[PDB]
Amino acid sequence: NQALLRILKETEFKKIKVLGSGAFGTVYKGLWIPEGEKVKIPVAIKELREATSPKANKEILDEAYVMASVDNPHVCRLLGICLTSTVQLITQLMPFGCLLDYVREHKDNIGSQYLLNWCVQIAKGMNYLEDRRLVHRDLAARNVLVKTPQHVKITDFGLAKLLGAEEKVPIKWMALESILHRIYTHQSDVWSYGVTVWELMTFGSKPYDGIPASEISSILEKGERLPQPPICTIDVYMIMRKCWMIDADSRPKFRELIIEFSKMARDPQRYLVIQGDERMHLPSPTDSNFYRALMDEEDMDDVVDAD
Ligand SMILES: *CCC(=O)N1CC(n2cc(-c3ccncc3)c(-c3cccc(NC(=O)c4cn(C5CC5)cn4)c3)n2)C1
């Protein structure tokens, strides 16, 4: 559906500040000025790294129209595109930033209810991508954005597919088959999900810290995996370990991860042990209503509360 992707002209928007970057390009906070209006509307803009040609631009545009249909409350939707000598992708601006920076800044202030609800939401967004037959290829805590502390969304999915580069590097998030054979499936996205859950449970620790990328395949072949985070109980750790099994079909499915983490979120102190957890509950209905009115009016399934 062509109505889901807006083609933007360089004159109606401006990049104003750098927000960060990745393997695909630099991210900016921008301002959109609708034609004839005096308002400046904040947007997020990703400017892709490699310069592009008119032939490549037509193929990218065709793929972008399909990519703009990827609609779920836990996945950031591509809203607009500007195709000139560079490819610029426009999306809604998330003022809280990525979940990786969030868990680091609010470490020893985040409770089990939040940690477990973020795992559920990420699995929901990943299950929706699997329902759309779209392999993410770059799932990590840096690619989970915070709309509000209660609502996270996945970004940067299928960027190789958008560019027509699926058959052409975040080694520490990759399944062993992706490292060895560049094979990417919904099951290698499950391995990346286990690493992302590990990043959240360690409040943003670096996976395999100190170990060079070239040594990772050999470490995985010897059966070594990321260590049990100090807050995880054995049941949570066993789910992460199942995500990192050599046999891809032995890993859990995203629909099963939604069910297990939803069950755990219903008795959160039994699955995660955090000091001072009794005073780090989910917001009351009053606070939740206020956050939504000011920055999150979109439709979304209820957050899992404790029994
Ligand atoms: C904290 C980690 C970090 O620094 N990162 C940079 C990367 N990131 C953040 C954003 C962002 C910030 C704030 N508000 C919103 C987003 C982005 C980002 C910006 C614009 C566009 C995108 N992605 C896409 O447009 C896009 C399109 N697809 C489909 C066509 C394939 C997938 N992603 C991301 N990036 C995290």
Side-chain angles (χ1 to χ4, degrees):
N1 182 11
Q2 300 199 344
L4 301 176
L5 183 69
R6 170 112 181 209
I7 307 300
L8 288 137
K9 276 182 62 100
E10 303 204 83
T11 181
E12 60 190 300
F13 73 92
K14 291 290 159 299
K15 299 170 287 285
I16 67 168
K17 195 218 171 151
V18 169
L19 290 172
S21 69
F24 297 96
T26 305
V27 180
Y28 301 87
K29 181 185 178 177
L31 294 178
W32 171 55
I33 300 188
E35 184 196 273
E37 305 291 348
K38 248 190 175 185
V39 76
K40 296 175 195 219
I41 311 298
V43 295
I45 305 160
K46 167 121 68 197
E47 184 158 49
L48 267 26
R49 203 164 156 165
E50 182 91 334
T52 181
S53 295
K55 182 183 299 263
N57 279 355
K58 297 293 193 64
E59 301 288 299
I60 291 169
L61 215 220
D62 273 35
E63 193 59 51
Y65 272 126
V66 184
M67 289 295 179
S69 73
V70 175
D71 186 41
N72 182 85
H74 297 112
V75 176
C76 293
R77 192 172 82 77
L78 171 63
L79 308 185
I81 187 153
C82 186
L83 297 172
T84 70
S85 70
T86 68
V87 176
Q88 289 173 93
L89 306 178
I90 284 78
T91 205
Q92 183 175 47
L93 184 72
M94 307 279 119
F96 285 89
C98 68
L99 189 49
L100 176 64
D101 293 350
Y102 195 87
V103 302
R104 291 173 168 172
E105 292 160 5
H106 303 77
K107 174 200 185 314
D108 297 1
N109 215 51
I110 297 166
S112 53
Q113 292 193 274
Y114 273 100
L115 287 167
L116 294 172
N117 272 279
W118 294 331
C119 293
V120 173
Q121 291 185 27
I122 294 165
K124 280 176 172 178
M126 292 302 297
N127 187 49
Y128 173 80
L129 297 175
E130 180 166 3
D131 285 339
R132 299 300 311 272
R133 302 292 184 130
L134 196 160
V135 176
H136 190 301
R137 295 200 181 199
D138 196 13
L139 180 63
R142 62 182 171 273
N143 289 145
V144 176
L145 304 180
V146 179
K147 183 170 191 185
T148 76
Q150 296 80 41
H151 181 3
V152 297
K153 312 176 72 157
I154 299 163
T155 193
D156 289 352
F157 50 94
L159 292 170
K161 185 173 179 163
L162 173 73
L163 266 9
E166 271 200 336
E167 268 81 66
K168 174 186 59 54
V169 59
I171 298 290
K172 295 170 173 201
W173 281 266
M174 285 160 69
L176 183 58
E177 71 268 18
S178 307
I179 298 170
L180 298 183
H181 297 110
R182 290 295 188 269
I183 290 176
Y184 299 88
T185 69
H186 302 115
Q187 293 309 280
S188 62
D189 274 352
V190 173
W191 182 295
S192 306
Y193 177 87
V195 179
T196 304
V197 171
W198 186 92
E199 293 176 273
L200 301 186
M201 304 297 184
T202 62
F203 306 99
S205 294
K206 284 146 211 73
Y208 318 101
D209 195 17
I211 298 168
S214 60
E215 305 196 341
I216 299 297
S217 55
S218 310
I219 285 160
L220 301 177
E221 282 166 340
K222 300 179 168 199
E224 298 204 287
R225 295 298 185 272
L226 290 164
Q228 182 173 180
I231 70 164
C232 298
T233 61
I234 200 65
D235 289 332
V236 173
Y237 188 54
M238 289 296 112
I239 287 166
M240 291 178 207
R241 294 292 294 250
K242 198 178 156 192
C243 289
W244 310 321
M245 283 171 95
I246 300 297
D247 180 31
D249 303 341
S250 299
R251 297 173 195 154
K253 300 290 289 169
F254 286 121
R255 52 192 176 264
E256 292 162 15
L257 292 163
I258 301 171
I259 289 160
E260 292 301 289
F261 279 102
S262 291
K263 169 206 65 185
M264 291 183 172
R266 277 189 285 278
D267 184 4
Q269 299 180 32
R270 172 161 314 277
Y271 294 100
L272 294 180
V273 185
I274 296 155
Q275 249 200 294
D277 206 23
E278 70 275 355
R279 51 187 166 262
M280 296 184 302
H281 55 88
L282 288 171
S284 69
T286 311
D287 300 337
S288 174
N289 283 338
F290 191 77
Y291 251 120
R292 290 192 48 85
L294 289 176
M295 52 194 317
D296 191 12
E297 302 179 305
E298 80 171 297
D299 243 312
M300 176 196 156
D301 291 348
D302 301 349
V303 310
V304 188
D305 215 331
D307 294 335

